[PDB]
Symmetry: D2
């Protein structure tokens, strides 16, 4: 029961910044060969430069396009022989009050945040089942469990991701594959930075620890779940929120 | 503190059979003017015949079509003056293991089971907010909370529905509108009633009460939530499962 | 229906607030209601309040041994087997864990948790005889989310939920359901006193933007006690205005 | 964000066998000075023998007696300077149908499984607050969350432990102390049981120990008031 990921191959979607970036760095530093994705060639290049010291690399992935995720995964499998760890972190927000919410704001969220996970998870499955080993780790927000005004779309997608994960866990468990979610609370990121103070102050006041978390806190939890230390943990949602929600 | 729905107007989607039919009958018997929907003209006619004794009616609704949900709700508002209660029960299944699930099986579930609720809930909102009164009640399987092999799609949609509901509850609560889910467990429906007896016993064994529930049990819970007896209940998931899951 | 005609109900802690509303509501629905208080004076007041519905007040100090058991035996002999038990009796003894007295821990566990063990056990034999048993435990939102200064109260209320789930699994084959109702911010005398500016901090946590009423809890209990909830067991029904959405 | 516990002092109650034993071994191997407890002298001796290679030791702790928990913790604090990690694992079962359950079966469970945690957690608190650092980790069974026939007493105690932990987490969090629970499912100590899991097998005591090490470490500094389920998918909250 070590966290040595030497010889493992990991795919981290949405690895250009914040939580995704920390996850990729952490798995790479633990010994995994890491492929991190971004939606742009500049994002991918940055990931490649950042992961270079650990032999990791950046790749372009537009989750909306058909057959792109599938090709990427096939390429990884062919080049490296297997995919051991999939971290689904790619996601966007399109916040609006339901009263004002556009159809496209709903649809884009469901496609980018939820369908993307269906596609990636399905694609890695054949290989993982054949090897009788795997980790799928989905990054889902606290908002998925408690709901949030202005985020009926984002919350629905993140909650759906949890329902998806539990169902997948039941399908693939007999082959030793675990499927879990990590639920960040208020983590210091671009999204939390753009917040006004009463909102920020209101958020920190809800936490037991009295502070925002760090992207590294999420990465730490992902490493734990990706490792042999979590081989009997599946279908779970691990909340990393400083005590803002205690289910 | 009564369950007298005299003077209330209710829309129940998917009211042709089973749970939806029982819900419509129950709200109607409690005094509500009930509009129940089906996907076909024959379904709608059958609903009309069934609800005739209570002054209810059947209408055609194909949730996949744009502007149909919206037009129906507008028509109800104009004909009957307001919409007090929305029960989102329309849903389908397209079961498969993730490893062979077709893209269309994913997409159709998300459209029919989840996007339909976005559309209907958005559409009734203007009227409910003006009235400073309302009930939205979403029927969400237990599978949404615990997951189910073969149903990554259905589970994702039903779990998403819960996240949606919690978020909506937070948006509309200041206007006195409540938004809740009812989560059926193993209920006797077309899809279960005709299962082999040995297989039925495997479901009933999981319950504390030792039996499949009845569609009427779900209807009873919906009536409670729709009434003045539940005016301080919002953002909740009421599990009606005979003890097969105790969250 | 929610017609409880012919049913016998015991409601512990029925003098005031939530418990009083529960007793009145079950009684008005047709049940023969026995409501409890810790003193004969309390019991007399309950008797006066329930008189028009044929209800009565009785004394129950949970701290005393054999009192719960004797009361239930007396009810069984005098009126008949119990159909409905509502465990509402409870106290608070708030303190920071750092300075919490042993007695503050022990008294909470005795009054709020062991009382439920004792009452639930005592009604069980008779209720198994009946067609449609109901045990309904009043827990607090604090049992599910925790609360600073209430490690004791929270532990007892959370324990009550674990107890209920386990009991539900034992007694279901006899048609008995066991459920909890979890009040959030319900207006009491002590919250009613708070400054208006202070009331706002509580209401801001709710989706509905207001405190609830004791009657809201009573309404939920009536639902669960009735034939309308025959397939609901081992559940915690949160009546909190959206302050917590599990 | 390492799992190096060098320089840390840990108290693990109920460390004689199974889960408790694995926890103590694991924290010790990670570098902590570990004190493990048992209710009997034979249990304490066995712990001492097992932890000897890591400089750990066994101590007798009868949670039912007053002032014993408190004295033990004070002794540890005086000898080692601080207590960094408390793992509350001590517990018993007294299973019976509620119909048959004796008052003593209820009372014993509440005393040994729940009050013991109140006492231990209270006792370590002053020191942890002074250090502005700590970990309290409570071992609570899946039965606390889902309930179990024959175990109204055990389930009530284990569920109560979770409520306690959440409340404590809210009180002590401003000082950087985290309070969490680990909920084991079916851990080895058959097909009808394994069929209830997604993984199709019983777990190992080491799986629980692995989760406790994670929570005890710097890798879990932003995790508090949580219940981490290690059940192979038997329950997915």
């Amino acid at each position: 029961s070590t966290q040595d990921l030497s010889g493992k191959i990991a795919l981290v979607t949405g690895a250009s910044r914040g939580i995704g970036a920390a996850i990729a760095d952490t798995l790479a530093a633990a010994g995994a060969k890491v492929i991190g994705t971004a939606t742009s060639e500049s994002g991918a290049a940055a990931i490649s430069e950042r992961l270079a010291q650990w032999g990791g690399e950046g790749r372009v992935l537009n989750s909306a396009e058909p057959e792109t995720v599938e090709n990427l995964i096939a390429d990884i499998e062919k080049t490296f022989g297997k995919l051991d760890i999939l971290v689904n972190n790619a996601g966007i927000t399109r916040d609006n009050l339901l009263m004002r919410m556009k159809e496209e704001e709903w649809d884009d969220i469901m496609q980018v945040n939820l369908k993307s996970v269906f596609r990636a998870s399905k694609a890695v499955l054949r290989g993982m089942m054949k090897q009788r080993a795997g980790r799928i780790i989905n990054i889902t927000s606290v908002v998925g469990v408690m709901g949030n005004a202005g985020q009926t779309n984002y919350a629905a997608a993140k909650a759906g991701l949890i329902g998806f994960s539990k169902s997948m866990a039941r399908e693939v468990g007999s082959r030793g594959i675990t499927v879990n979610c990590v639920a960040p609370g208020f983590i210091d990121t671009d999204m939390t930075r753009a917040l006004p103070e009463e909102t920020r102050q209101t958020f920190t006041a809800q936490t037991a620890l009295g502070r925002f978390g760090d992207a590294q806190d999420i990465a730490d939890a992902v490493l734990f779940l990706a490792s042999d230390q979590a081989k009997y943990i599946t279908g779970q949602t691990l909340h990393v929120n400083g005590g803002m929600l205690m289910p």
